[PDB]
Design a protein around this ligand. Structure first.
Ligand SMILES: *[C@@H]1O[C@H](CO)[C@@H](O[C@@H]2O[C@H](CO)[C@@H](O)[C@H](O)[C@H]2NC(C)=O)[C@H](O)[C@H]1NC(C)=O
Ligand SMILES: *[C@@H]1O[C@H](CO)[C@@H](O)[C@H](O)[C@H]1NC(C)=O
Ligand SMILES: *[C@@H]1O[C@H](CO)[C@@H](O)[C@H](O)[C@H]1NC(C)=O
Length: 411
């Protein structure tokens, strides 16, 4: 039974606790949901960080992790999830249906093979070796999120347990891997013993559709939010890119990878406007508006060559966002997982490496453009100051990664 084809009827979905939201078409709406959480969570994460600190994460990964957890959710815990991750914005739907749409979203995201640009997703459950897990939870987790259940000796050998998990992450999350994201959820019982660990991996390998030439790269000044500056490696190139100059100076620019399914969007505000303001103003609706107004346009592209990485606890922000019960040893309601449970820890680790090739291994490459004469009055895009970055799947319109480049300088 292939999920990709299977209809809603074919895949039962024996849901323990069902919840009705207030008042491909579905797959498209889930992406909106997923994107609403993304930008929101980013704003929270941003306010908790310093302006000149880089930010990077994969919100798709996060949504997926907590969607998996939602499988056993019940009562308020269930609702809070549906609300915090905006799953309830798919008007008049139900807990279990969200998982059908995710099965579809995943298919068109990962199963659809044919690269030049590679997007792979790996999910695994690591549950206590000596417990009896609910078979519906098992099956559905496997079916929908392709997550298998591996037993570990959490009780008597937590040390070796951690090793087992890491040996697996390494085999998945860093062939070369220049961009990835890892999400870990620790589920514990009232006794402070690890019952289950949810692990989500997503990583991307993509060659620029219009690659820069290393020969044209040169050390130049990047201007930090602290008013100082440092030496960045500026990549350079001229060409046809989807672009748009929106509200008060802000430049939006799309750089697609080979395949055209996956692209990198940059958001670069004028020198006199702070990235902070833009971040605060970045509502899901505005963002969508910007992506639409994008039109091909010959221009020059000055963009630094960088490697950013990030790591943070999901707990605080998620709580402030409404997700309380799930972390509350007393309130946490996840009955559908074992035949109590609460989330003790939820951390996220990610990094993105970009260069003349794209999200790929640096290479000794050159470029020759022969009979070209471009209007001396063309637009220029010089990212020598902090700018946002998304890596979205266009067809499905989902934000795979996102972050901020506040300092690309390597020193
Ligand atoms: C695992 O949880 C599932 C719900 O996700 C339970 O399945 C239900 O079981 C009850 C009684 O056994 C049936 O009346 C329902 O038809 C089943 N489905 C639903 C959606 O409720 C199941 O009981 C649990 N299994 C174990 C071993 O605890
Ligand atoms: C949770 O939902 C169940 C049935 O879905 C219901 O019986 C119960 O009253 C709700 N609240 C609690 C605290 O169990
Ligand atoms: C992961 O391990 C498998 C063996 O199951 C091996 O075939 C594969 O090459 C490894 N992948 C990476 C990225 O190391």
């Amino acid at each position: 039974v292939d999920i990709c084809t299977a209809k809603p009827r074919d895949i039962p979905m024996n849901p323990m606790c069902i919840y009705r939201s207030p008042e491909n078409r579905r797959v498209w709406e889930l992406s909106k949901a997923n994107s609403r959480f993304a930008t929101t969570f980013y704003q929270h994460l941003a306010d908790s960080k310093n302006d000149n600190d880089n930010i990077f994460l994969s919100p798709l990964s996060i949504s997926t992790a907590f969607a998996m957890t939602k499988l056993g959710a019940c009562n308020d815990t269930l609702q809070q999830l549906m609300e915090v991750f905006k799953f309830d914005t798919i008007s008049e739907k139900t807990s279990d249906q969200i998982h059908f749409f995710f099965a579809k979203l995943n298919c068109r995201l990962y199963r659809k093979a044919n690269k030049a640009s590679k997007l792979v997703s790996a999910n695994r459950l690591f549950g206590d070796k000596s417990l009896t897990f609910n078979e519906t939870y098992q099956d559905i987790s496997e079916l929908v999120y392709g997550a298998k259940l591996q037993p570990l000796d959490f009780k008597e050998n937590a040390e070796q347990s951690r090793a087992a998990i890491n040996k697996w992450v390494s085999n998945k999350t860093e062939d070369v891997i220049p961009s990835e994201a890892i999400n870990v959820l620790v589920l514990v019982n009232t006794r402070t013993s690890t019952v289950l660990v949810l692990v989500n991996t997503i990583y991307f390998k993509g060659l620029w559709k219009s690659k820069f030439s290393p020969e044209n790269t040169r050390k130049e000044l990047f201007y930090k939010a602290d008013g100082e500056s440092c030496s960045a490696s500026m990549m350079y190139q001229e060409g046809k890119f989807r672009y748009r100059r929106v509200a008060e100076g802000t430049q939006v620019l799309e750089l697609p990878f080979k395949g055209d399914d996956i692209t990198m969007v940059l958001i670069l505000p004028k020198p006199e406007k702070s990235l902070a303001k833009v971040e605060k103003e970045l509502t899901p609706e505005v963002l969508q508006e910007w992506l639409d107004e994008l039109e091909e346009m010959m221009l020059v592209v000055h963009m630094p060559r960088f490697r950013i990485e990030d790591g943070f606890s999901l707990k605080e922000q998620l709580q402030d966002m409404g997700l309380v019960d799930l972390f509350s040893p007393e309130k946490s309601k996840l009955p559908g997982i074992v035949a109590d449970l609460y989330v003790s820890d939820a951390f996220h680790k990610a990094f993105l490496e970009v260069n003349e090739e794209g999200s790929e291994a640096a290479a000794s490459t050159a470029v020759v453009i022969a009979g070209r004469s471009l209007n001396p009055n063309r637009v220029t895009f010089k990212a020598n100051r902090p700018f946002l970055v998304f890596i979205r799947e266009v067809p499905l319109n989902t934000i795979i990664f996102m972050g901020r480049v506040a300092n690309p300088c390597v020193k």
